[PDB]
């Protein structure tokens with residue numbers, strides 16, 4: 001039990017900040033994750049050997065796509081680590097255990113294609129899961145990996161604690177379906193403003209964990225401008241491949257996914273910040289005041305995209 005992970009000094013300090021970038025050294029990401037689990041949860045949350053075997057099976061089941069990759073998984077888990085560390089007392093032992101795992105697993109076996117593309121392609125996963133198609137798949141892969149011999153990182157939980165943590169993970173992963181985010185945030189906005197938001201109401205906690213999941217999932221828009229700008233290229237590399245595949249099915253893709261419309265990206269980033277990101281981190285900041293740095297970084301990046309449009313870069 002006496003075996004800590006320790007990071008170099010710059011990482012030890014910067015990993016506590018919301019805008020931390022996990023860096024280009026893939027072989028350090030498992031250790032960064034274990035470090036975050038040890039501080040977020042405890043050195044006793046998980047058997048190290050099991051957790052290490054789980055992490056590497058999760059990594060193996062992320063594909064080599066430009067954005068929805070192993071780096072995205074660890075990045076989204078680090079944003080969750082930062083939310084949990086800045087909100088020490090608000091979350092149960094089971095939630096701390098479940099949420100970092102849910103974030104690491106939330107896009108397992110992603111192919112770089114939206115729920116929409118699977119539905120138009122008539123992918124078998126769209127027959128199995130009519131809504132939140134990829135997200136039900138990601139949860140399904142998470143359960144598959146938990147069931148591999150030596151991979152049950154939760155084995156020391158009671159039967160009912162195990163059912164609760166898999167239920168946290170399932171709702172947490174379903175919530176990363178952005179189609180569900182709009183209504184979830186509107187409801188949380190109404191509840192916060194009429195004063196009815198109650199964190200002892202399980203269905204309220206669920207909604208708040210959902211918004212955290214969106215916040216962590218979108219956290220590329222909360223980095224320093226050079227990270228945000230370079231990640232946008234990975235995001236659009238997937239979208240334009242999906243666009244190309246839509247054109248192959250005989251469907252004009254939306255402009256966001258059409259590589260012939262790269263010029264419209266700065267404006268498309270504005271829409272996205274104004275319709276999705278800013279509202280997300282605003283309602284999050286209202287519910288969890290110490291997550292304000294995410295909102296502040298998001299606003300900084302909106303301003304940088306405004307400057308791109310004004311040809312000031």
Ligand SMILES: COc1ncc(C2CC2)nc1C(=O)NCCc1nc(-c2cccnc2)n[nH]1
Nearest residue numbers: 178217218219220221235256268269271272275
């Ligand atoms: C331009 O899109 C994105 N840019 C950056 C990132 C960063 C966080 C990774 N993610 C998306 C993204 O996930 N788009 C797909 C889903 C989606 N887009 C919209 C939308 C767009 C424009 C205006 N209103 C709404 N609703 N749903």
Ligand SMILES: [Mg+2]
Nearest residue numbers: 106107134176
């Ligand atoms: Mg996803």
Ligand SMILES: [Zn+2]
Nearest residue numbers: 106107176217
């Ligand atoms: Zn994701």
